[PDB]
């Protein structure tokens with residue numbers, strides 16, 4: 192859809208989530224994570240750089256984390272338009288960067304393309320090694336790029352020293368890292384993404400909890416059905432998902448035939464049956 196419509200839609204979704212009045216530590220926690228992310232964007236980021244004209248590019252790889260961020264970002268883009276009108280919708284696409292690699296799952300590539308069309312992203316896609324170099328090439332093509340939005344957060348307990356607004360290290364080309372999802376935990380991610388009713392990468396439906404490349408990521412061994420029985424913690428969000436109101440259906444994207452072959456050897460609960468952040472990357476490495 193056109194960008195103004197995507198932005199207004201995401202605004203309604205986020206607003207609707209913020210109006211959930213349920214007994215729930217998860218919901219209340221996620222409402223707080225939403226408010227902080229939106230405060231970073233509206234109060235610290237969009238005040239300093241334009242989210243429309245190319246000063247900022249959004250790094251998007253179709254994963255759950257940058258998808259949640261993209262929905263929040265679009266919600267803030269809607270609000271930004273009115274704030275700037277108040278202090279003084281364009282027909283265009285949102286500048287976005289996707290690094291495509293040889294080991295990228297086709298299912299994910301397809302999801303990136305489809306959601307680029309849904310959210311009206313103007314996609315730069317690299318030609319299918321090291322991410323630092325991929326971005327160095329990007330910045331050389333688009334030197335006006337001042338900042339890049341990154342859906343990074345803490346997914347193991349180890350010290351990382353990340354900040355919401357942070358310069359790249361000297362290894363990397365110079366631009367500002369914008370990392371407003373940093374305080375989200377795994378339960379917040381699933382609660383919001385399932386509530387949104389937006390389509391999500393079909394790999395999560397097959398037991399992935401973290402998506403890498405074909406060779407470095409698998410369904411989460413802790414979701415293997417014959418040896419684990421996790422409870423569903425997001426039933427309310429699923430049943431009452433935005434605009435849904437078949438209540439129990441989850442909007443997963445199609446698995447590419449090649450990936451279906453690759454996964455035939457796999458007996459796994461969907462990713463949203465994992466809430467233990469310590470175990471999020473267990474299917475990786």
Ligand SMILES: Cc1cc2nc3c(=O)[nH]c(=O)nc-3n(C[C@H](O)[C@H](O)[C@H](O)COP(=O)(O)OP(=O)(O)OC[C@H]3O[C@@H](n4cnc5c(N)ncnc54)[C@H](O)[C@@H]3O)c2cc1C
Pocket residue numbers: 250251252254256257288289290291322326339340341342343344346358359360361362363368
């Ligand atoms: C734009 C950018 C700038 C970075 N700058 C530094 C730096 O200065 N110093 C440093 O030590 N490390 C830097 N990194 C690496 C980063 O800190 C993480 O160590 C690395 O991304 C792996 O973390 P992760 O596995 O948790 O998340 P990842 O799986 O890498 O995902 C984290 C986020 O990065 C973006 N991303 C990941 N893969 C892609 C892709 N293929 N295409 C487009 N976006 C993608 C998405 O927004 C995603 O939400 C940078 C990474 C990116 C993407």
